[PDB]
Amino acid sequence: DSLSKSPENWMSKLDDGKHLTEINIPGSHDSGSFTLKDPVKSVWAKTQDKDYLTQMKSGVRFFDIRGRASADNMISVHHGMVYLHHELGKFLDDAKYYLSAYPNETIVMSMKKDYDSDSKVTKTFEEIFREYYYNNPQYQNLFYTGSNANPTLKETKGKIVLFNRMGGTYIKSGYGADTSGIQWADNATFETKINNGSLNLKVQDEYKDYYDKKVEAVKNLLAKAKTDSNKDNVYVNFLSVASGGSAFNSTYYYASYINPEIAKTIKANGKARTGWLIVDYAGYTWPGYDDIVSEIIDSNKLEH
């Protein structure tokens, strides 16, 4: 049966000799925003309706955690200025729970500063994450701490791999974990070397695009991935787009079009390499339409 038939443990069915970069991985954009209930706010600030555990059950393996330092020992999960009602510990604990339940999966956790620190804060965002989370004995063994820039599934399964969107860091394991960090171009499709030249990161993150331009930018990077068997190359492709347009169109509304359009394209490509595709409303189904998370999972080729 289809891998998308067992989303809760799909990675367990792959050759663990694969480099994570080579795996087609569904991600959720602003993963933590499922806590939002305020309907006026949710139009533009809510990007998911499944909680973290349910997103994992649904096969999501890449988490977009954007944060704000709200005390010298605390990072709160945020969508820009909007507080998402929990701290990073909650994500970590859920991840840790899911990984012991499904220990042949790995999670890639992207970490970004999304808003200015609370005025009492005396430490940088990167220092707080490094000291109060990554290095914290409480989360001992949860993070990938290997020295490989291009780790395999074997060496990462059971753990969270950092995907560093903080800037330069003194953390030494994970994507962009060095004193340069990742050069991220605003609202752009771009390409930049990371991990001291070891990896070429190719990103589509045109989050302010109107609809047609967004779909075209998702497909342009999709088409590139399909031609590229290089493991030293990493694709991150965000289908998520910012709210606005003809009425005051929600992030959901756009996801209801983009997700099925890309799901279908991938399905028609069969087993082509896709890269890591980051979506809004991961796991949200619409009768009659292909499901993006499911098609990303199924696009992985089992050759072993």
Domains of the chain (ranges, CATH numbers)? 1-304 (3.20.20.190)
- Strands 82-87, 74-79: pairing is antiparallel
CA 20 distance to own-chain centroid = 13
For residues 209 and 219, is the Cβ–Cβ distance under 8 A?
no
CA–CA dist 42, 27 (Å, integer): 20
The answer for residues whose C-beta is within 8 angstroms of residue 296's C-beta and 6 or more apart is: 24, 25, 26, 266, 274, 277
Q: Cβ atoms within 10 A of the Cβ of 231, count?
A: 14
CA–CA dist 161, 117 (Å, integer): 25
Q: Which two tokens stand for residue 267?
A: 């399905």
For residues 286 and 256, is the Cβ–Cβ distance under 8 A?
yes
Angstrom CA distances, 283 to 65, 125, 159, 301, 304, stand at: 18, 31, 23, 21, 28
Measured at the CA of 65, the angle between CA 231 and CA 124, to 5 degrees, comes to: 105
Q: Which residues pair with 190 in a beta bridge?
A: 203
For residues 163 and 195, is the Cβ–Cβ distance under 8 A?
no
For residues 225 and 236, is the Cβ–Cβ distance under 8 A?
no
CA–CA dist 26, 17 (Å, integer): 19
Q: Which residues pair with 189 in a beta bridge?
A: 204
Q: Obtained via which technique?
A: X-ray
For residues 72 and 123, is the Cβ–Cβ distance under 8 A?
yes
Q: Per-residue DSSP letters for the chain?
A: --GGG-GGGGGGGS-TTSBGGGS-EEEETTGGGGG---HHHHHHH----S-HHHHHHTT--EEEEEEEEEETTEEEEEETTEEEEEEHHHHHHHHHHHHHHSTT--EEEEEEE-SPPPTT--S-HHHHHIIIIIT-GGGTTTB---S-SS-BHHHHTTSEEEEEESSS-S--SSBT-SSS---PPTTEEEEEEETTTTEEEEEEE-TT--HHHHHHHHHHHHHHHHT---TTEEEEEE----S-SSS---HHHHHHHHHHHHHHHHHHHTT----EEEESSTT---TTS--HHHHHHHTS----
For residues 20 and 153, is the Cβ–Cβ distance under 8 A?
yes
User: In terms of residues, how long is the chain?
Assistant: 304
The closest alpha carbon to 205, from 32, 30, 82, 81, belongs to 30
- Map tokens 């991840």 to a residue: 95
Q: Which two tokens stand for residue 4?
A: 């998308």
* Phi, psi of 234, deg, nearest 5: -125, 125
Show which residues are catalytic: 29, 79
- Strands 62-71, 25-28: pairing is parallel
